[PDB]
Design a protein around this ligand. Sequence first.
Ligand SMILES: [Cl-]
Ligand SMILES: [Cl-]
Ligand code: NA
Length: 129
Amino acid sequence: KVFGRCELAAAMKRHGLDNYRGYSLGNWVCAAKFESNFNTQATNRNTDGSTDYGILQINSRWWCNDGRTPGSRNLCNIPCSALLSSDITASVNCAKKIVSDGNGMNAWVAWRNRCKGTDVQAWIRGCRL
Ligand SMILES: [Cl-]
Ligand SMILES: [Cl-]
Ligand code: NA
């Protein structure tokens, strides 16, 4: 499923991401935009053979199991395919674990390079939340 901007914002808010660990909702929407273009089915292969999955491009080296990233951890204890569902619950619950691990949203390269230090509230402007 390809989310609309306000649709996703509303779904992330209902799943508790607004101000989770201090990150306002605009940060999460901005990250999703640049990681996956709001597409829950996005996948991208990394140089090290791991793969990024879903709307927040969660990495199989650490966070989910795709059966083909040897020596990888499965810290969200889910199959990576669960992160491609139109229901964002699994991606959101896993993202909560990622952002709490110490580095905050710097774990998402696109957030660091394209959202951090920008007017991220613009991403939820005009949405009925
Ligand atoms: Cl915001
Ligand atoms: Cl980037
Ligand atoms: Na959903």
